[PDB]
Amino acid sequence: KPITIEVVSMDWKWFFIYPEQGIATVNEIAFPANTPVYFKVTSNSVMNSFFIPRLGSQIYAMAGMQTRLHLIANEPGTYDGISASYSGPGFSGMKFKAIATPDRAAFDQWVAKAKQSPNTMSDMAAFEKLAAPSEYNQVEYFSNVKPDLFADVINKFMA
Amino acid sequence: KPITIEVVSMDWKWFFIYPEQGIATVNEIAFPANTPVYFKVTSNSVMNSFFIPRLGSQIYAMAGMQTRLHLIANEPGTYDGISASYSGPGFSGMKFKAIATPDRAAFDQWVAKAKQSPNTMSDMAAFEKLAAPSEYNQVEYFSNVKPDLFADVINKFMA
């Protein structure tokens, strides 16, 4: 029933991981409406803001630390997500999309469309490649992800 | 008499600017011993630590904010500078060098060796190029720098 999503604000794009489903995406998340969505958030750069106005959901993202946000979307639809309003270039294109699908079958189907992507997120080398400075990043799916990649990222900023 | 140095911890290297002299360098600073050195510090990435153990000098570097450290080196020499001990790769090669030269004539001469570099730091485009992810960066000089480049960097993380 509850969906867990791991968020990592990279330089000028958002990266999302679906620990239970085995996928990861960039600038786009989906989940069934009227369902408990569980976000684990962290930054891999400067501190940021995981903000979805329409859903009254805001949570900071900071390197070295994992924040949490619990969300329920009651009406189906696609909500926009914005990031921190820093005046710097690159932050401006740092938006993402929240697809609160009409039901779970629709969610299941979105996973399936992801599991069909050729490109994966299997190791940290792949991680830093994606992590490299990029503006206005387009949506992207990854049919496979390294098991504890969220943890691995936090450990980069431990002491 | 007092020397002002602007510090910016980039991803896995240190960048230094000499506002009054007109130069900038990477992983290496110099100043005459027994002279007041004035550091303005900021980060362009995660928070860091501008640390020179031998001189009992530590100051955090944070994006959006300018910290300050006042230092006097009494004995001439070259002191090592280390950064924050995060467990992440890239941080390990984030070291720099503190040349507290025997006197000012020697300092003046170090400027001169810098003013002779072909490569400059004239605009923000040049800034982000340097700013791009790079490990074990070697020392480098820039004979020219954009006047208020430190300010320009802080403004990237204003709201």
Beta pairing partners, B31: B100
| Identity of the residue in A86, A156, A157 whose CB atom sits nearest the CB atom of B157 | A86
Please judge whether A159 and B86 are an interchain contact, meaning their C-beta atoms are less than 8 angstroms apart: yes
Q: What's the token pair of residue B22?
A: 């007109």
Question: Counting beta carbons within 10 angstroms of the beta carbon of residue A147, is it exposed (0 to 12), middle (13 to 18) or buried (19 or more)?
Answer: exposed
Q: How many CB atoms lie within 10 A of CB B41?
A: 23
The CATH number for A11's domain is 2.60.40.420
Separation CA B94–CA B80 (nearest Å): 11
Distance of CA B27 to the CA centre of its chain: 7
Judging contacts by C-beta atoms under 8 Å, the chain B residues touching residue A8 are none
Domain range spanning residue A104?
1-159
Cα of first residue to Cα of last residue in chain B, in angstroms, is: 36
**Of A156, A121, A130, A96, nearest to A11 (Cα)?**
A130
Measured in angstroms, the CA of B11 and the nearest CA of chain A are apart by 10
> How many structural domains does chain A have?
1
Let me know: does B68 contact B38? Beta carbons within 8 Å. yes
Q: What is the resolution of this structure in A?
A: 2.5
For B159, nearest residue in chain A (alpha carbons):
A86
For A132, nearest residue in chain B (alpha carbons):
B133
Please judge whether A159 and B85 are an interchain contact, meaning their C-beta atoms are less than 8 angstroms apart: yes
Separation CA A50–CA A154 (nearest Å): 17
